[PDB]
Design a protein around this ligand. Structure first.
Ligand SMILES: *[C@@H]1O[C@H](CO)[C@@H](O[C@@H]2O[C@H](CO)[C@@H](O[C@H]3O[C@H](CO)[C@@H](O)[C@H](O)[C@@H]3O)[C@H](O)[C@H]2NC(C)=O)[C@H](O)[C@H]1NC(C)=O
Ligand SMILES: *[C@@H]1O[C@H](CO)[C@@H](O[C@@H]2O[C@H](CO)[C@@H](O[C@H]3O[C@H](CO)[C@@H](O)[C@H](O)[C@@H]3O)[C@H](O)[C@H]2NC(C)=O)[C@H](O)[C@H]1NC(C)=O
Ligand SMILES: *[C@@H]1O[C@H](CO)[C@@H](O[C@@H]2O[C@H](CO)[C@@H](O[C@H]3O[C@H](CO)[C@@H](O)[C@H](O)[C@@H]3O)[C@H](O)[C@H]2NC(C)=O)[C@H](O)[C@H]1NC(C)=O
Ligand SMILES: *[C@@H]1O[C@H](CO[C@@H]2O[C@@H](C)[C@@H](O)[C@@H](O)[C@@H]2O)[C@@H](O[C@@H]2O[C@H](CO)[C@@H](O)[C@H](O)[C@H]2NC(C)=O)[C@H](O)[C@H]1NC(C)=O
Ligand SMILES: *[C@@H]1O[C@H](CO)[C@@H](O[C@@H]2O[C@H](CO)[C@@H](O)[C@H](O)[C@H]2NC(C)=O)[C@H](O)[C@H]1NC(C)=O
Ligand SMILES: *[C@@H]1O[C@H](CO)[C@@H](O[C@@H]2O[C@H](CO)[C@@H](O)[C@H](O)[C@H]2NC(C)=O)[C@H](O)[C@H]1NC(C)=O
Ligand SMILES: *[C@@H]1O[C@H](CO)[C@@H](O)[C@H](O)[C@H]1NC(C)=O
Ligand SMILES: *[C@@H]1O[C@H](CO)[C@@H](O)[C@H](O)[C@H]1NC(C)=O
Ligand SMILES: *[C@@H]1O[C@H](CO)[C@@H](O)[C@H](O)[C@H]1NC(C)=O
Ligand SMILES: *[C@@H]1O[C@H](CO)[C@@H](O)[C@H](O)[C@H]1NC(C)=O
Lengths: 41, 239, 328, 49, 45
């Protein structure tokens, strides 16, 4: 029951930022992340 | 330290199982191997001559007839090498641009602490560690990333004594009842003391300013000096 | 990006001739490699496009209330009322460049191109999807500052973000607030001067237009080489075959292969080299997006001339435009 | 920037000969293609500077 | 408050003279006069 499907791509998760003239978001905790990068030399 | 050790665990586990990751370096090796194969396969091309093999034209023809055949294989093999060398010269400039990039990222991310956004990988840049690869380099970039945000009301400035006040470093927030000063990148609230803040002008001009009292931390150091004082006076009235 | 192309090499040299195809085989895989090299070019136009625009993983939308402290993004935010949800300034930029086709359904230079196996291919991301990534990049900026680049999006009042901005250029945050109506009016006046400029002048987009102009011209040159003799008795392939016998054709056809095939290797060299010019321009544009649009740059003159506050991206045909906002 | 160069493709290939120049017409636009390639470089040397 | 200190006044080529305020000083001074008034009133009884 697998088959090739074709679709208009979704670009990512759609969002609306909780903006207002007197609202801020400040982070109480943080993640330390390590990302690989690969380059030709 | 635990989150760093954990995320290096995630690096090992990532590259442990999946093939696709090193596809950039595989693509450089694959183009170089492909072009050498493609160049070799041009030794099979006739170019209208009675063989691909030079020595067969020389096994069967004399000087007068062979030159009309050999000059074909010269013309087409020279053109095949003129192509391969144009391709490899062009490709080589891609590798040069990458080698200048890999040195620039070494320079600012490994030997330094870059303030270029999304250059040394995603997050705010802490540091990076180099690793070799066949014909490449791998950077392990370490980054601070904010995780757990909380909605606060916020104010550009505070009015305490007609004077307008601003954080020296950070921002003002309200937890919904009390105003505090905190650093822009991590929630750590403090009392809006006259040490956290500086002043400019008066509260007529600042759009969206509000009312809140500002603590001078010298005031009760003197008001305790005043109750120390007024008891030395009460004592001195007794003799 | 530049225009995607592909070239049916066997159609270009040998348009509907079995003979010319059988003789083209005598040079082995020369067409194959050309197909592979234009393929290498064409893949990397979508890489170039995706690196410049997909610098976010969320499609941020502005709130419906424009409570931004006086700054008037209505000229760079989406117009909802147009089907292309582009900005005011984008709809100027898309008028200024007049593309000779993009692959929008053929069912003139480009009739000749099609009949010689030369085909313009459609890009992976449509001008609407590019406008959407651009809308997200902008809508994040005016609600979330630099934080939407560096991690999860964090809201902030726009006038508060601009205070931190002013700190970034070595100016103290009271200086903004004590002049906020002026700073809004200057920004609004400046956005107005970009409109009044781009609407009026015929010389602005020369940088993009010259790329497009060469893509058109190189295809037109590669068409026109089919009219050469190369010392054969005709440039028309069938005027050889319908005049001469098999043996006598092979001289003439080998002359046309000797010409046409060099005509393709020349073009595919030019295209490759050109591609290295554009790959650098795209890698630069993605860098400016990262540091000027997702960030604020302490690099001098990197984000336009002056002490950098912020940048807003806008899309254009085969390109991007940066509105760089600066304190002078 | 490097030295700007430009070429008379007839004077390089067929220098002081009509006879060769006719045999070159058979190849068509290639000389102008080369000229443009060199005129492109030559503008960019001023631009780089 | 605005300024930090290093060295005595010879070493800096092109040094100048300008009265530098201490915002702690009049705060202890207006307190010295209040206190002075206290002292005096304690003389009256
Ligand atoms: C906004 O932040 C305020 C500071 O964290 C917080 O108020 C604080 O509430 C605690 C109790 O939860 C108080 O702690 C004191 O409570 C009494 C005071 O007599 C004593 O029995 C305790 O030993 C202790 O000293 C703090 O005094 C109080 N601080 C202030 C400035 O009021 C608010 O509750 C926060 N608002 C919300 C909505 O969460
Ligand atoms: C924030 O706190 C300020 C200080 O309490 C407060 O200012 C005060 O506002 C009142 C009401 O307007 C004034 O009352 C006087 O108004 C005029 C003179 O300005 C007179 O004709 C009236 O009879 C009345 O006496 C206070 O004089 C004024 N004082 C100061 C120092 O500001 C603001 O109104 C507060 N704002 C908010 C948002 O709460
Ligand atoms: C800037 O202000 C300084 C303080 O007023 C001032 O220094 C003073 O300079 C005079 C003149 O040289 C000195 O006068 C004494 O000079 C020697 C001892 O150094 C004695 O033999 C003399 O009899 C005389 O008493 C002051 O002692 C000296 N004091 C201090 C604290 O510096 C500078 O001269 C001023 N400079 C300028 C550019 O105006
Ligand atoms: C921060 O607040 C926004 C909305 O502001 C609040 O929304 C009300 C529900 C209430 O708390 C009021 O006092 C405030 O005005 C939040 O946005 C909501 O997000 C949820 C999904 O999580 C969504 O279903 C709602 O429709 C959103 N509401 C609005 C008005 O936008 C936001 O999630 C809050 N963030 C955090 C971390 O709490
Ligand atoms: C910040 O987030 C970390 C996780 O990334 C929290 O640490 C975890 O805390 C829970 C209990 O609260 C434990 O069960 C986990 O084992 C902890 N993990 C680690 C890596 O120690 C941390 O408590 C959070 N801190 C704050 C202040 O929010
Ligand atoms: C932001 O500026 C735009 C103009 O660039 C304003 O939009 C105009 O509004 C007037 C009055 O309704 C209309 O006559 C124009 O047709 C509008 N122009 C366009 C292009 O839409 C807009 O009102 C301004 N925003 C604010 C908050 O003042
Ligand atoms: C924010 O703007 C609204 C109008 O959109 C206004 O009613 C409100 O008082 C403003 N609040 C602040 C803190 O500026
Ligand atoms: C009050 O001052 C006297 C000296 O005049 C001293 O002996 C006494 O200990 C002081 N008492 C207190 C409570 O300070
Ligand atoms: C500055 O230059 C002038 C000459 O124009 C000289 O007289 C003066 O002493 C100099 N002062 C300093 C501090 O260099
Ligand atoms: C002294 O001060 C007291 C307050 O402690 C006051 O009631 C009294 O009138 C003052 N007397 C004089 C003479 O100043």
């Amino acid at each position: 029951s697998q088959s090739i499907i074709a679709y208009t791509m979704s670009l990512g998760a759609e969002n609306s930022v909780a903006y207002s003239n007197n609202s801020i978001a400040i982070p109480t905790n943080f993640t330390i992340s390590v990302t690989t990068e690969i380059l030709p030399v | 330290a635990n989150q760093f050790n954990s995320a290096i665990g995630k690096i090992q586990d990532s590259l442990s199982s999946t093939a696709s990751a090193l596809g950039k370096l595989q693509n450089v090796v694959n183009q170089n191997a492909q072009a050498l194969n493609t160049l070799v396969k041009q030794l099979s091309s006739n170019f209208g001559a009675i063989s691909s093999v030079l020595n067969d034209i020389l096994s069967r023809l004399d000087k007068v007839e062979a030159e009309v055949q050999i000059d074909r294989l010269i013309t087409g093999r020279l053109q095949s090498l003129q192509t391969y060398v144009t391709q490899q010269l062009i490709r080589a400039a891609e590798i040069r641009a990458s080698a200048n990039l890999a040195a620039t990222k070494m320079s600012e991310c490994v030997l330094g602490q870059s303030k270029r956004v999304d250059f040394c990988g995603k997050g705010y840049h802490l540091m990076s560690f180099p690793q070799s690869a066949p014909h490449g380099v791998v950077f392990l970039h370490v980054t601070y990333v904010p995780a757990q945000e909380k909605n606060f009301t916020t104010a550009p400035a505070i009015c305490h004594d007609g004077k307008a006040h601003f954080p020296r470093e950070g921002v003002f927030v309200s937890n919904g009842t009390h105003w505090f000063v905190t650093q822009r990148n991590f929630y750590e609230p403090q009392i809006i003391t006259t040490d956290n803040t500086f002043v400019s002008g008066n509260c007529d001009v600042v759009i969206g300013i509000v009312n809140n009292t500002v603590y001078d931390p010298l005031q009760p150091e003197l008001d305790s000096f005043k109750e120390e004082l007024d008891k030395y006076f009460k004592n001195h009235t007794s003799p | 990006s530049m225009t995607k192309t592909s070239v049916d090499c066997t159609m270009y040299i040998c348009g509907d001739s079995t003979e010319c195809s059988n003789l083209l085989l005598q040079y082995g895989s020369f067409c194959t490699q050309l197909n592979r090299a234009l393929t290498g070019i064409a893949v990397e136009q979508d890489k170039n496009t995706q690196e410049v625009f997909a610098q976010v993983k969320q499609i941020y939308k502005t709130p419906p209330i424009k409570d931004f402290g006086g700054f008037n993004f209505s000229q760079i935010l989406p117009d909802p009322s147009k089907p292309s949800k582009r900005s005011f300034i984008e709809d100027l930029l898309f008028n200024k460049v007049t593309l000779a086709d993009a692959g929008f359904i053929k069912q003139d230079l480009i009739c000749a191109q099609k009949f010689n196996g030369l085909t313009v291919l459609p890009p992976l991301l449509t001008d609407e999807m590019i406008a959407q990534y651009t809308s997200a990049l902008l809508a994040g900026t005016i609600t979330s500052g630099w934080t939407f680049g560096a991690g999860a999006a964090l809201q902030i009042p726009f006038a508060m973000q601009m205070a931190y901005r002013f700190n970034g250029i070595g100016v103290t945050q009271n200086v903004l607030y004590e002049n906020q109506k002026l700073i809004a009016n200057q920004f609004n006046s400046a956005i107005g001067k970009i409109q009044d400029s781009l609407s009026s002048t015929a010389s602005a987009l020369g940088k993009l237009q010259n790329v497009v102009n060469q893509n058109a011209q190189a295809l037109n040159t590669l068409v026109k080489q089919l009219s050469s003799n190369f010392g054969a008795i005709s440039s028309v392939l069938n005027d050889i075959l319908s005049r001469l016998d098999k043996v006598e054709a092979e001289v003439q056809i080998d002359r046309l292969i000797t010409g046409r095939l060099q005509s393709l290797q020349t073009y595919v060299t030019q295209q490759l080299i050109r591609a290295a010019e554009i790959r650098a321009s795209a890698n630069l544009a993605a860098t400016k997006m990262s540091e000027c649009v997702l960030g604020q740059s302490k690099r001098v003159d990197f984000c336009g001339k002056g002490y950098h506050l912020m940048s807003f991206p806008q899309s254009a045909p085969h390109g991007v435009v940066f509105l760089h906002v600066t304190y002078v």
